């Protein structure tokens, strides 16, 4: 559902992913219809064009995709349960949405795990 937008373009979310990316730099949010001055903003479950800013050089200087799997910006469940994370990290992923890592680090959000069938499986936990 609605997930209050957390990670505007320019954000540097961490890479939770198995890969050698250390952190992602959000470049733009896929599916972002734009109002005028508004910055595109990734939120939980969103695919994101992101360049690794730190980590293995092979990943370092190309735009990459990444779904956001956790988020310090808290959001409200339809269940009425506002919730949030210690950190907001994403995982690198294909345009298809298959994830390129072999295993996600920390907890993955419930609506990361539900949009992304593969992300859900590698997730150590769902939240």
């Amino acid at each position: 559902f609605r997930v209050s937008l957390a990670l505007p373009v320019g954000a540097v979310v961490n890479c939770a992913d198995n890969t050698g990316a250390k952190n992602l730099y959000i470049i733009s949010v896929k599916g972002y219809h734009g109002r005028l001055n508004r910055l595109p903003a990734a939120a939980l479950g969103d695919i994101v064009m992101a360049s690794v800013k730190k980590g293995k050089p092979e990943l370092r200087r190309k735009v990459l995709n990444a779904v956001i799997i956790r988020q310090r910006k808290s959001w409200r469940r339809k269940d009425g349960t506002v919730i949030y994370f210690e950190d907001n990290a994403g995982v690198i992923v294909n345009p298809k949405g298959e994830m390129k890592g072999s295993g996600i680090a920390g907890p993955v959000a419930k609506e990361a795990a539900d949009l992304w069938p593969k992300i859900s499986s590698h997730a150590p936990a769902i939240v």
Partner: protein
């Protein structure tokens, strides 16, 4: 270029000329229906939330409890005090006339005064002595002939019973009078509902029912001479801006050589009339004395009351019938909000949904309020020094 800031059909944004939130248009009359009243004045109390099991094929929440906010609207029965007929004319509806009830509660006659108690209190005094006489009974009889004949619209003139509201904060004692249209069957049928119901109370539960929606109309909360940034939502200017930030930088051009009605300007925001649609009725609620275990759902059995522990802030206990409807309702707490039968088609999959509440909330509004019950709070803290300094006194007596 970006879209316009603000809806131009809500304009002028001026103070409403009333506060009672009168219905602008009643839903279209349907002869096939049996006669009924189309609206009901109610007093906004406060909000809570409820848990509910959405059971809506599709979505990620079907079969899953969801916390909806609800507004509670205390609804003491309105009293009908007169009928009104309208006749269609090429220039538009004209009142045929009205038949007042043989008797009128003082709260109603308070309404015709600015200072009732220092008045001679003569309102409806000639009617009272004339409706009694056969001369005035035949005259009242003729008005109904005119309704059954020339009318297209029958309307009850109902009012709120503030005496019965017993709210300590809604300071009014003038009754909130208002015509409430009778959509229904043939005009004789509407007259008949109208006159049998011509001095009786009218509970909401007759006009409405649960899970059905209601359009609301109430003046929205007043904000005074609001500025353009709060009034229209325009972007405030960059810090470096000189004359001031909170302005529309360009309120016009060379031509047309004047400010247009469309550029945003500082002025009254709030306290505008609004008709908001499709507010689902999560529960009609009977008066606390009659049905004390309000807010006690099938899945939450503790005897309980719709009013929070601190009472509603600024309003207090809901001592009466209450409509509990989903989401926000325009207007401040304790404003009187007319709420009509829906004018929308109401055949939506959502609107038709039955709403079985799983948990009315009753925690304090005031602080966070982690207790649903005054009994449960005591069941947490247990006895404490206010009691020991109380219990000891009782033993001494």
């Amino acid at each position: 270029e970006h879209p316009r800031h603000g809806h131009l059909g809500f304009l002028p944004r001026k103070r409403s000329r009333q506060i009672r939130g009168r219905v602008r248009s009643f839903p279209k009359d349907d002869p096939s229906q049996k006669p009924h009243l189309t609206s009901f004045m109610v007093f906004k109390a406060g909000m809570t939330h409820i848990v509910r099991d959405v059971d809506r094929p599709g979505s990620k929440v079907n079969k899953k409890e969801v916390v909806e906010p609800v507004t509670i609207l205390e609804a003491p029965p309105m009293v009908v005090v007169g009928i009104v007929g309208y006749r269609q004319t090429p220039v538009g509806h004209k009142t045929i006339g009205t038949v007042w009830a043989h008797h009128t509660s003082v709260e109603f006659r308070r309404r015709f005064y600015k200072n009732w108690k220092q008045s001679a209190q003569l309102a409806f005094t000639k009617r009272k002595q004339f409706a009694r006489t056969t001369e005035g009974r035949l005259a009242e009889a003729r008005t109904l002939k005119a309704f059954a004949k020339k009318a297209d619209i029958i309307r009850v003139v109902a009012h709120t019973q503030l005496r019965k509201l017993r709210n300590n904060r809604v300071g009014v004692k003038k009754a909130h009078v208002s015509e409430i249209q009778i959509n229904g069957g043939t005009i004789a049928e509407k007259i008949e509902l109208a006159k049998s119901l011509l001095e009786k109370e009218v509970r909401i539960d007759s006009i409405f029912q649960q899970s059905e929606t209601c359009d609301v109309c109430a003046v929205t909360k007043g904000h005074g001479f609001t500025g353009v940034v709060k009034r229209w939502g325009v972007a405030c200017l960059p810090r470096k801006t000189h004359r001031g930030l909170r302005k529309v930088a360009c309120i016009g051009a060379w031509h047309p050589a004047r400010v247009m009605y469309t550029v945003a300007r500082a002025g009254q925001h709030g306290y505008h009339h609004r008709t908001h649609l499709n507010k689902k009725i999560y529960q009609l609620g009977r008066a606390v004395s009659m049905e004390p275990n309000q807010a006690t759902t099938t899945y939450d059995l503790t005897a309980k009351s719709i009013t929070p522990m601190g009472g509603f802030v600024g309003y207090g206990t809901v001592r009466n019938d209450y409509i509990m409807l989903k989401g926000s309702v325009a207007g401040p707490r304790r404003r009187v909000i007319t709420l009509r039968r829906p004018m929308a088609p109401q055949t939506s999959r959502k609107l038709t949904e039955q709403i079985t509440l799983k948990f009315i909330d009753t925690s304090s509004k005031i602080g966070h309020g982690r207790f649903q019950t005054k009994k449960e709070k005591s069941q947490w803290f247990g006895p404490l020094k206010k009691d020991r300094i109380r219990r000891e006194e009782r033993l001494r007596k």
